[PDB]
């Protein structure tokens, strides 16, 4: 059975079986004034499978999301937004769909309002590791990899794993830039706690980290007041969250997703749009909280 | 300035400033009839300071938690249980007290009802790791370490860091044994998500992983291979949770805490008790919800 609601102020309540008639979601809290249409939700849904015009065989276009309420004459009403997807079963991506349509709403709002940008990349597949982040690169390839010379190796390992009835794990990094300072609610609802909560709704995640993350176990503490001219430090070891409330820096979150035509070799990659969506959903929730708290 | 509550049926609400008059919690959802007394709570609270005869300088009384409601003639009546700690002067860290007191209740009930056993240990302090685990050893030393050979090294490392005025992070593994199958509520309140969320209320935590955790990203798939030899699948690769639901295996959780007179080089080892407590609070909540669902 389910436990289907997320958020205190920005809230998403969902329903629907992948084999059922359709999927639904009620999203509460989005301010009135936001230009929004169905296309704004398809763009993100359609990113879970990176074409473009290029995937599998018998490409008949996907199940289309539909706004049932909440927007009048192209802008949000201030009222609960209803989303519906009517399944033409005629594939556990539909298990993911409402989260993404919802995240998109929070992404757009945060972009328009603050210029907050949320994006993710695969730093790793099994034993191949990216070593360079270039954002113009990630949509140019189907692994969401930002290292253009990594891409090729990723390509061979995958071609090498379809050759053998096998699958590999992945590790995704998600950043949220331009996020104001002060968001989060300790004791129990620190922004890092709600972020971990949210990412952990993706199936196959087995760890969540922020900033330098687990490498913290082995570190030693000195970056403190030291000799000479500049002096900082802004290496953002915290991953943009201190004491559980946003810093002003980029927020760095990483998750590790396990091993799962009809061949995955790495499904874990495709987790990036949702991983991206979950961070949007949390931050949006926290923005409203921070605002309500003056 | 708080979000001062956690849980949906097992629910813990708190308040109190460290330099305030006192701390308080209201605990919901504990069935009637579990033997409980202040004494049972103090024990967990006092486990923070591994000093029976012990520690720096001289010894306070120390501050004592008082049970205000919900208990008659030694047992839970099943009415909201109120806890109170009156603060004193002529010092403590103390934003952790009500969590341990509350987890102590979850723990006892789960130990009495289901035989569930939750305990934690330090697998790593900075550049020193422990290899092997003897539950008998953990309370012998002041590092919740389970490797008796490691302990001399941990002591060396830590005695050096204090005189150097340096600090180091640590890594902790917390285990939940004999936990029944079925617990957790996906989509969004999957038990690993509620664990992570809870572990992250501990300050300095920068990562949470379940089972093999961040290791999985470099893993490859075979569920199993057919032979007149084998690896049986009671290595908890899962760490006791699949699809967000307890599997009946032992639940394994790791956390990585970062580096931060009286000086902490690694205060992170002193978080072991509160991590046990959070795991207990989340397990309790999910027990009740599993019950309310049948």
Coordinates of C-alpha atoms in Angstrom, one line a residue:
Chain A
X1 CA 0.0 0.0 0.0
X2 CA 1.1 3.6 -0.2
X3 CA 2.2 6.8 1.8
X4 CA 1.6 9.4 -0.9
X5 CA 2.1 12.9 0.1
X6 CA 5.2 15.1 0.3
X7 CA 5.7 18.6 1.7
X8 CA 4.4 20.9 4.4
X9 CA 3.7 23.9 2.4
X10 CA 4.5 22.9 -1.1
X11 CA 2.7 19.6 -1.3
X12 CA 2.3 16.9 -3.8
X13 CA -0.3 14.2 -3.3
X14 CA -0.3 11.4 -5.7
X15 CA -2.1 8.3 -6.8
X16 CA -2.1 5.8 -9.6
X17 CA -0.8 2.3 -10.7
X18 CA 1.5 2.0 -13.7
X19 CA -0.9 -0.7 -15.0
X20 CA -4.0 1.3 -14.1
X21 CA -6.2 3.7 -16.0
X22 CA -4.1 6.7 -15.2
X23 CA -1.9 8.7 -12.8
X24 CA -2.8 11.7 -10.8
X25 CA -1.4 14.4 -8.5
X26 CA -2.7 17.3 -6.5
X27 CA 0.0 20.0 -6.0
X28 CA -0.7 22.7 -3.3
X29 CA 1.0 26.0 -2.7
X30 CA 2.2 27.4 -6.0
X31 CA 1.6 31.2 -5.9
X32 CA -0.7 32.8 -8.4
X33 CA 0.9 34.6 -11.3
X34 CA 3.2 31.9 -12.7
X35 CA 2.9 31.4 -16.5
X36 CA 2.4 27.6 -16.9
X37 CA 1.1 25.2 -19.5
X38 CA 1.2 21.5 -20.2
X39 CA 4.3 21.8 -22.5
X40 CA 6.3 23.0 -19.5
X41 CA 5.7 19.6 -17.9
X42 CA 6.2 17.4 -21.0
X43 CA 9.7 18.8 -21.6
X44 CA 10.8 17.4 -18.3
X45 CA 8.8 14.1 -18.6
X46 CA 10.4 13.7 -22.1
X47 CA 13.9 14.1 -20.6
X48 CA 13.7 10.7 -18.8
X49 CA 14.3 9.1 -22.2
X50 CA 16.9 11.2 -24.2
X51 CA 16.0 11.1 -27.9
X52 CA 15.7 13.4 -29.6
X53 CA 13.6 11.7 -32.3
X54 CA 16.1 8.9 -31.7
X55 CA 15.1 6.1 -29.3
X56 CA 14.2 2.3 -29.4
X57 CA 11.9 1.3 -32.2
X58 CA 8.2 2.1 -32.8
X59 CA 8.3 5.6 -31.3
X60 CA 4.6 6.6 -30.9
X61 CA 4.6 9.6 -28.8
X62 CA 4.3 9.4 -25.0
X63 CA 1.5 9.6 -22.5
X64 CA 0.6 13.2 -22.2
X65 CA 0.2 15.0 -18.9
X66 CA -2.8 17.3 -18.6
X67 CA -3.6 20.2 -16.3
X68 CA -7.1 19.7 -14.9
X69 CA -7.2 22.7 -12.5
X70 CA -5.1 25.5 -11.0
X71 CA -4.3 27.6 -14.0
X72 CA -6.6 30.2 -15.5
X73 CA -5.8 31.9 -18.9
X74 CA -2.2 30.5 -18.8
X75 CA -1.2 31.5 -15.3
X76 CA -1.5 29.8 -11.9
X77 CA -4.6 30.6 -9.8
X78 CA -3.2 30.2 -6.4
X79 CA -5.4 27.1 -6.1
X80 CA -4.5 23.4 -6.1
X81 CA -3.2 22.1 -9.3
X82 CA -4.5 18.8 -10.7
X83 CA -2.5 16.7 -13.1
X84 CA -3.6 13.6 -14.9
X85 CA -1.9 11.2 -17.2
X86 CA -4.3 8.8 -19.0
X87 CA -2.4 5.6 -19.6
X88 CA -2.3 4.0 -23.0
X89 CA -0.6 0.8 -21.9
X90 CA -1.1 -0.2 -25.5
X91 CA 8.4 0.3 -18.0
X92 CA 8.6 1.8 -14.5
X93 CA 8.8 5.3 -15.7
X94 CA 5.2 5.9 -15.0
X95 CA 6.1 5.3 -11.5
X96 CA 8.1 8.5 -11.7
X97 CA 5.9 10.8 -13.7
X98 CA 4.0 12.9 -11.2
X99 CA 7.0 13.6 -9.2
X100 CA 8.6 15.1 -12.4
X101 CA 5.7 17.0 -13.7
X102 CA 5.5 18.5 -10.1
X103 CA 9.2 19.2 -9.9
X104 CA 9.0 21.1 -13.1
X105 CA 6.5 23.4 -11.6
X106 CA 8.8 24.1 -8.7
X107 CA 11.8 24.5 -11.1
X108 CA 10.1 27.1 -13.2
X109 CA 8.9 29.1 -10.2
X110 CA 12.3 29.1 -8.6
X111 CA 14.0 30.0 -11.9
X112 CA 11.6 33.0 -12.6
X113 CA 11.7 34.1 -9.0
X114 CA 15.3 33.7 -8.0
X115 CA 17.2 32.4 -11.0
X116 CA 17.7 29.2 -9.2
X117 CA 19.0 26.5 -11.5
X118 CA 18.9 22.9 -10.7
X119 CA 20.9 20.3 -12.7
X120 CA 22.4 16.8 -12.5
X121 CA 25.1 14.8 -14.0
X122 CA 26.4 11.3 -13.9
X123 CA 29.9 11.4 -12.5
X124 CA 30.0 7.6 -12.8
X125 CA 28.9 4.3 -14.3
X126 CA 30.3 1.2 -12.8
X127 CA 34.0 1.6 -13.1
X128 CA 34.3 4.5 -15.5
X129 CA 34.6 8.0 -13.9
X130 CA 34.0 11.5 -15.3
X131 CA 36.6 14.1 -14.2
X132 CA 35.3 17.3 -15.9
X133 CA 32.1 19.2 -15.6
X134 CA 30.9 21.0 -18.8
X135 CA 27.1 21.8 -18.8
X136 CA 26.9 22.2 -22.6
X137 CA 28.1 18.6 -22.7
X138 CA 25.5 16.8 -20.6
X139 CA 22.6 17.2 -23.1
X140 CA 24.8 16.2 -26.0
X141 CA 25.0 12.7 -24.8
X142 CA 22.7 10.0 -23.3
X143 CA 24.4 9.5 -20.0
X144 CA 24.0 13.0 -18.7
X145 CA 27.8 13.1 -18.6
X146 CA 29.5 16.4 -18.5
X147 CA 33.0 15.1 -19.5
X148 CA 33.2 14.9 -23.3
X149 CA 36.1 12.5 -23.3
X150 CA 34.4 10.3 -20.6
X151 CA 31.4 9.9 -22.7
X152 CA 33.0 7.4 -25.1
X153 CA 34.3 5.1 -22.4
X154 CA 30.8 5.1 -20.7
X155 CA 29.7 4.1 -24.2
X156 CA 32.0 1.0 -24.5
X157 CA 31.3 -0.3 -20.9
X158 CA 27.5 -0.1 -21.7
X159 CA 28.0 -1.8 -25.1
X160 CA 30.2 -4.2 -23.2
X161 CA 27.5 -4.9 -20.6
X162 CA 24.6 -5.5 -23.1
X163 CA 27.0 -8.1 -24.6
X164 CA 26.6 -10.0 -21.3
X165 CA 23.2 -10.0 -19.5
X166 CA 24.6 -7.6 -16.9
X167 CA 23.9 -4.2 -15.3
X168 CA 26.0 -1.5 -13.6
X169 CA 25.6 1.1 -10.9
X170 CA 25.8 4.8 -11.2
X171 CA 26.5 7.9 -9.1
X172 CA 24.7 11.2 -9.7
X173 CA 25.6 14.7 -8.7
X174 CA 22.9 17.3 -8.5
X175 CA 23.6 21.0 -8.0
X176 CA 21.1 23.8 -7.2
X177 CA 22.6 27.2 -8.0
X178 CA 21.7 30.7 -6.9
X179 CA 19.7 29.4 -3.9
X180 CA 19.2 32.1 -1.2
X181 CA 20.6 31.8 2.3
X182 CA 18.5 30.8 5.2
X183 CA 16.3 27.9 3.9
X184 CA 15.7 24.9 6.2
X185 CA 14.1 24.0 9.5
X186 CA 16.1 22.4 12.3
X187 CA 15.7 20.5 14.5
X188 CA 14.0 17.8 12.4
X189 CA 13.5 19.4 9.1
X190 CA 16.9 20.6 8.1
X191 CA 17.1 21.2 4.4
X192 CA 19.7 18.5 4.2
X193 CA 17.3 16.1 6.0
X194 CA 14.4 16.8 3.6
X195 CA 16.8 16.6 0.7
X196 CA 18.0 13.1 1.8
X197 CA 14.4 12.1 2.4
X198 CA 13.4 13.1 -1.1
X199 CA 16.3 11.6 -3.0
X200 CA 15.7 8.4 -1.2
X201 CA 12.2 8.1 -2.8
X202 CA 14.0 7.1 -6.0
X203 CA 14.2 3.5 -6.4
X204 CA 17.6 2.1 -6.3
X205 CA 19.3 4.9 -4.3
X206 CA 21.5 3.5 -1.5
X207 CA 23.2 6.5 -0.3
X208 CA 22.8 10.3 -0.2
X209 CA 25.6 12.8 0.5
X210 CA 26.0 16.6 0.7
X211 CA 29.1 18.5 0.0
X212 CA 32.2 16.4 0.2
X213 CA 30.0 13.8 1.8
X214 CA 31.4 10.5 3.0
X215 CA 35.0 11.6 2.3
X216 CA 34.4 13.6 5.5
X217 CA 35.0 10.6 7.6
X218 CA 38.7 10.7 6.6
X219 CA 39.3 14.4 6.8
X220 CA 41.0 16.6 9.4
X221 CA 39.8 19.9 10.4
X222 CA 41.7 22.8 9.4
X223 CA 40.6 25.4 7.0
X224 CA 40.5 28.1 9.7
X225 CA 42.0 31.4 10.2
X226 CA 45.4 31.2 8.5
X227 CA 48.2 33.5 7.4
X228 CA 48.3 36.0 4.5
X229 CA 46.3 37.8 1.8
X230 CA 43.1 36.4 0.3
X231 CA 41.7 34.5 2.4
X232 CA 38.6 32.4 2.4
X233 CA 37.8 29.6 2.1
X234 CA 35.1 28.9 -0.6
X235 CA 35.8 25.2 -1.6
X236 CA 32.2 24.6 -0.4
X237 CA 32.9 21.5 1.5
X238 CA 29.4 21.9 3.1
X239 CA 27.7 21.6 -0.3
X240 CA 25.9 24.8 0.5
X241 CA 24.2 23.8 3.8
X242 CA 25.5 24.6 7.3
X243 CA 23.6 23.8 10.4
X244 CA 20.9 22.4 8.0
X245 CA 20.1 25.8 6.5
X246 CA 21.2 27.0 3.1
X247 CA 24.5 29.1 2.8
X248 CA 24.2 31.1 -0.3
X249 CA 26.4 28.6 -2.2
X250 CA 25.6 26.1 -4.7
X251 CA 24.0 23.1 -3.2
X252 CA 25.8 19.9 -3.9
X253 CA 24.0 16.6 -3.5
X254 CA 25.1 13.2 -4.6
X255 CA 23.3 9.8 -4.6
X256 CA 24.4 6.3 -5.5
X257 CA 22.0 4.1 -7.4
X258 CA 22.4 0.3 -7.5
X259 CA 22.4 -2.3 -10.3
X260 CA 18.9 -3.2 -11.4
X261 CA 15.5 -5.1 -26.8
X262 CA 14.7 -4.5 -23.1
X263 CA 18.2 -4.2 -21.9
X264 CA 19.1 -1.9 -19.2
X265 CA 22.7 -1.8 -18.6
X266 CA 22.3 1.5 -16.7
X267 CA 18.9 2.6 -15.7
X268 CA 20.5 4.5 -12.9
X269 CA 21.4 7.3 -15.3
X270 CA 17.8 8.0 -16.1
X271 CA 17.3 8.9 -12.5
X272 CA 18.7 12.3 -13.1
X273 CA 15.5 14.1 -14.1
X274 CA 13.7 12.8 -11.1
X275 CA 16.7 13.4 -8.9
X276 CA 16.6 16.9 -10.3
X277 CA 12.8 17.1 -9.6
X278 CA 13.1 16.0 -6.0
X279 CA 15.5 18.8 -5.1
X280 CA 13.2 21.3 -6.8
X281 CA 10.3 20.0 -4.7
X282 CA 12.1 20.3 -1.4
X283 CA 13.6 23.7 -2.1
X284 CA 10.3 25.0 -3.1
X285 CA 8.7 23.7 0.1
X286 CA 11.4 25.4 2.1
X287 CA 11.1 28.7 0.3
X288 CA 7.5 29.0 1.3
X289 CA 8.4 28.0 4.8
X290 CA 11.1 30.6 5.1
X291 CA 8.8 33.2 3.7
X292 CA 5.9 32.3 6.1
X293 CA 8.4 32.6 9.0
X294 CA 9.5 36.1 7.9
Chain B
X1 CA 12.8 29.0 14.9
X2 CA 12.2 25.3 14.5
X3 CA 10.6 22.5 12.9
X4 CA 10.2 20.7 16.2
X5 CA 8.4 17.6 15.4
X6 CA 9.1 14.2 13.8
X7 CA 6.9 11.2 13.0
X8 CA 3.3 10.6 12.0
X9 CA 2.0 8.1 14.5
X10 CA 5.0 7.7 16.8
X11 CA 5.4 11.4 17.2
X12 CA 8.0 13.4 19.1
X13 CA 7.5 17.2 19.6
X14 CA 10.1 19.2 21.3
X15 CA 11.1 22.6 22.6
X16 CA 13.8 24.2 24.7
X17 CA 16.9 26.5 24.4
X18 CA 20.2 25.3 25.8
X19 CA 20.5 28.4 28.0
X20 CA 16.8 28.3 28.6
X21 CA 14.9 27.2 31.7
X22 CA 14.6 23.7 30.4
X23 CA 13.8 21.1 27.7
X24 CA 10.6 19.3 26.9
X25 CA 9.1 16.7 24.6
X26 CA 5.7 15.3 24.1
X27 CA 5.7 11.8 22.8
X28 CA 2.8 10.3 21.0
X29 CA 1.8 6.8 20.0
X30 CA 3.3 4.5 22.6
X31 CA 0.9 1.6 23.3
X32 CA -0.2 1.0 26.9
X33 CA 1.7 -1.4 29.1
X34 CA 5.5 -1.1 28.6
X35 CA 7.5 -0.8 31.7
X36 CA 9.1 2.5 31.9
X37 CA 10.7 4.7 34.3
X38 CA 12.9 7.7 34.3
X39 CA 15.8 5.4 35.1
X40 CA 15.4 3.8 31.7
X41 CA 15.8 7.2 30.0
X42 CA 18.7 8.4 32.1
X43 CA 20.7 5.4 31.2
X44 CA 20.5 6.4 27.5
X45 CA 21.2 10.1 28.3
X46 CA 24.3 9.3 30.4
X47 CA 25.7 7.1 27.5
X48 CA 26.6 10.3 25.8
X49 CA 29.5 10.9 28.1
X50 CA 31.5 7.8 28.2
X51 CA 32.7 8.7 31.6
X52 CA 31.5 6.4 34.4
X53 CA 34.3 7.6 36.8
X54 CA 35.6 9.7 34.1
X55 CA 36.6 12.6 31.7
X56 CA 38.2 16.0 32.0
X57 CA 38.3 17.9 35.3
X58 CA 35.4 17.4 37.8
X59 CA 32.0 15.9 37.8
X60 CA 28.4 17.2 37.8
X61 CA 25.4 15.5 39.1
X62 CA 24.1 15.8 36.1
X63 CA 20.8 17.1 34.9
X64 CA 17.9 14.8 35.4
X65 CA 15.0 14.0 33.1
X66 CA 11.6 13.9 34.7
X67 CA 8.6 12.0 33.3
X68 CA 5.4 14.1 33.7
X69 CA 2.6 12.2 32.1
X70 CA 1.6 8.9 30.4
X71 CA 2.8 6.6 33.1
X72 CA 0.9 4.9 35.9
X73 CA 2.4 2.6 38.4
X74 CA 5.4 2.0 36.2
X75 CA 3.7 1.5 32.9
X76 CA 2.6 3.4 29.8
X77 CA -1.2 4.2 30.0
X78 CA -1.0 5.0 26.3
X79 CA -1.5 8.8 26.9
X80 CA 0.9 11.5 25.5
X81 CA 4.1 11.1 27.6
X82 CA 5.7 14.3 28.7
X83 CA 9.3 14.7 29.5
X84 CA 11.0 17.6 31.2
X85 CA 14.6 18.5 31.9
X86 CA 15.2 21.5 34.2
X87 CA 18.6 23.1 33.3
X88 CA 21.3 24.0 35.8
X89 CA 24.5 26.1 36.2
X90 CA 27.7 26.4 38.3
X91 CA 27.1 23.1 31.0
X92 CA 25.9 20.8 28.1
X93 CA 25.2 20.0 24.4
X94 CA 21.9 19.3 25.2
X95 CA 20.0 20.0 22.0
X96 CA 20.3 16.2 21.8
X97 CA 18.7 15.2 25.1
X98 CA 15.1 14.9 24.2
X99 CA 15.9 12.8 21.2
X100 CA 17.8 10.2 23.2
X101 CA 15.1 10.2 25.9
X102 CA 12.4 9.7 23.2
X103 CA 14.4 7.1 21.3
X104 CA 15.0 5.2 24.5
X105 CA 11.2 4.6 24.7
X106 CA 11.0 3.5 21.1
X107 CA 14.0 1.2 21.7
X108 CA 12.6 -0.5 24.8
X109 CA 9.3 -1.1 23.3
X110 CA 10.9 -2.6 20.2
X111 CA 13.2 -4.7 22.3
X112 CA 10.3 -6.0 24.4
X113 CA 7.8 -6.4 21.6
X114 CA 9.8 -7.8 18.8
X115 CA 13.3 -8.5 20.1
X116 CA 14.7 -5.7 18.0
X117 CA 18.2 -4.8 18.7
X118 CA 19.7 -1.5 17.6
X119 CA 23.3 -0.6 18.3
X120 CA 26.0 1.6 16.7
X121 CA 29.7 1.6 16.5
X122 CA 32.6 3.7 15.1
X123 CA 34.2 2.2 12.0
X124 CA 36.5 5.2 11.4
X125 CA 38.1 8.2 13.0
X126 CA 40.0 10.2 10.5
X127 CA 42.9 8.1 9.0
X128 CA 42.3 5.2 11.4
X129 CA 39.8 2.4 10.6
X130 CA 38.5 -0.6 12.6
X131 CA 38.4 -3.9 11.0
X132 CA 36.3 -6.3 13.0
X133 CA 33.3 -6.2 15.4
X134 CA 32.8 -7.6 18.9
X135 CA 29.7 -6.2 20.4
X136 CA 31.2 -6.9 23.8
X137 CA 34.1 -4.5 23.2
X138 CA 32.0 -1.5 22.1
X139 CA 31.2 -0.3 25.7
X140 CA 34.7 -1.1 26.9
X141 CA 36.4 1.9 25.3
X142 CA 35.4 5.5 24.9
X143 CA 35.0 5.4 21.1
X144 CA 32.1 2.9 20.7
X145 CA 34.8 1.0 18.7
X146 CA 34.3 -2.8 18.2
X147 CA 37.9 -3.7 17.3
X148 CA 40.0 -4.1 20.4
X149 CA 43.2 -3.7 18.4
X150 CA 41.9 -0.5 16.7
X151 CA 41.3 1.1 20.0
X152 CA 44.9 1.8 20.9
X153 CA 45.4 3.4 17.5
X154 CA 42.1 5.5 17.8
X155 CA 43.5 6.6 21.2
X156 CA 46.8 7.5 19.7
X157 CA 45.3 9.5 16.8
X158 CA 43.0 11.3 19.1
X159 CA 45.5 12.2 21.8
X160 CA 47.7 13.6 19.1
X161 CA 45.0 15.7 17.5
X162 CA 44.0 17.4 20.7
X163 CA 47.5 18.6 21.6
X164 CA 47.8 19.7 17.9
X165 CA 44.5 21.6 18.2
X166 CA 43.1 19.6 15.2
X167 CA 39.8 17.8 14.7
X168 CA 38.8 14.9 12.4
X169 CA 35.6 13.4 11.0
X170 CA 34.3 10.0 11.7
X171 CA 32.1 7.2 10.3
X172 CA 29.5 5.3 12.0
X173 CA 27.6 2.1 11.3
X174 CA 24.3 1.6 13.1
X175 CA 22.5 -1.8 13.0
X176 CA 18.9 -2.8 13.6
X177 CA 18.5 -6.6 14.2
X178 CA 15.4 -8.8 14.2
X179 CA 13.3 -6.1 12.5
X180 CA 10.2 -7.5 11.0
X181 CA 9.5 -7.5 7.2
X182 CA 6.8 -5.2 5.8
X183 CA 7.8 -1.8 7.4
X184 CA 7.9 1.5 5.4
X185 CA 5.6 3.5 3.2
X186 CA 6.7 4.3 -0.3
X187 CA 6.4 6.4 -2.3
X188 CA 7.7 9.2 -0.2
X189 CA 7.9 7.7 3.3
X190 CA 10.0 4.7 2.5
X191 CA 11.8 3.6 5.5
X192 CA 15.2 4.3 4.1
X193 CA 14.0 7.8 3.3
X194 CA 12.7 8.3 6.9
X195 CA 16.0 6.9 8.2
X196 CA 18.1 9.3 6.2
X197 CA 16.0 12.1 7.1
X198 CA 16.4 11.3 10.7
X199 CA 20.1 10.6 10.7
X200 CA 20.6 14.0 9.1
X201 CA 19.1 15.8 12.2
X202 CA 22.4 15.0 13.8
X203 CA 24.8 17.9 13.3
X204 CA 27.9 17.4 11.2
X205 CA 26.4 14.5 9.3
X206 CA 27.2 14.9 5.6
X207 CA 26.1 11.5 4.4
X208 CA 23.8 8.6 4.9
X209 CA 24.0 5.2 3.2
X210 CA 21.9 2.0 3.5
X211 CA 23.5 -1.4 3.1
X212 CA 26.4 -1.3 0.6
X213 CA 25.6 2.4 0.1
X214 CA 28.0 4.5 -1.9
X215 CA 29.8 1.3 -2.9
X216 CA 27.0 0.2 -5.2
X217 CA 27.8 2.8 -7.8
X218 CA 30.8 0.8 -8.9
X219 CA 28.9 -2.5 -8.8
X220 CA 27.8 -4.9 -11.5
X221 CA 24.7 -7.0 -11.8
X222 CA 24.1 -10.6 -11.3
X223 CA 21.4 -11.5 -8.9
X224 CA 22.7 -15.0 -8.9
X225 CA 24.6 -17.7 -11.0
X226 CA 23.6 -21.3 -11.3
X227 CA 26.1 -23.7 -9.7
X228 CA 27.1 -26.6 -7.6
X229 CA 28.7 -23.8 -5.6
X230 CA 27.2 -20.3 -4.9
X231 CA 27.1 -17.0 -3.0
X232 CA 23.8 -17.0 -1.0
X233 CA 21.9 -13.7 -0.9
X234 CA 22.2 -13.0 2.9
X235 CA 24.9 -10.6 2.3
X236 CA 22.8 -7.5 2.9
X237 CA 23.7 -5.8 -0.1
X238 CA 20.3 -4.1 0.6
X239 CA 21.1 -3.4 4.2
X240 CA 17.7 -4.7 5.2
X241 CA 15.5 -2.6 3.0
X242 CA 14.1 -3.3 -0.5
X243 CA 11.7 -1.0 -2.4
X244 CA 11.5 1.0 0.8
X245 CA 10.3 -1.9 2.9
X246 CA 12.0 -3.9 5.6
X247 CA 13.0 -7.3 4.3
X248 CA 13.6 -9.0 7.5
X249 CA 17.4 -8.8 7.3
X250 CA 19.3 -6.6 9.7
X251 CA 19.2 -3.0 8.7
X252 CA 22.5 -1.4 8.2
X253 CA 23.0 2.3 8.2
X254 CA 26.2 4.3 7.9
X255 CA 26.9 7.9 8.5
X256 CA 29.8 10.2 8.0
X257 CA 30.2 13.1 10.4
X258 CA 32.6 15.9 9.7
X259 CA 35.3 17.5 11.7
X260 CA 34.4 20.4 14.1
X261 CA 40.1 23.6 27.9
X262 CA 37.5 21.1 26.7
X263 CA 38.3 20.0 23.1
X264 CA 36.7 17.8 20.5
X265 CA 38.9 16.3 18.0
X266 CA 36.2 13.9 17.3
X267 CA 32.9 14.6 19.0
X268 CA 31.6 12.6 16.2
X269 CA 32.0 9.4 18.2
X270 CA 29.6 10.8 20.8
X271 CA 26.9 10.9 18.2
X272 CA 26.6 7.1 18.2
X273 CA 23.9 7.2 20.9
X274 CA 21.8 9.7 19.2
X275 CA 22.0 7.8 15.9
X276 CA 20.7 4.7 17.6
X277 CA 17.9 6.9 19.0
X278 CA 16.9 8.2 15.6
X279 CA 16.8 4.8 14.0
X280 CA 14.6 3.7 16.9
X281 CA 12.2 6.6 16.5
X282 CA 11.8 6.0 12.8
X283 CA 11.4 2.2 13.3
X284 CA 8.8 2.8 16.0
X285 CA 6.8 5.2 13.8
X286 CA 6.8 2.6 11.0
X287 CA 5.7 -0.2 13.2
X288 CA 2.5 1.7 14.2
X289 CA 1.8 2.8 10.7
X290 CA 2.2 -0.8 9.5
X291 CA -0.3 -1.8 12.3
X292 CA -2.8 1.0 11.4
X293 CA -2.6 -0.3 7.8
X294 CA -3.8 -3.7 8.8

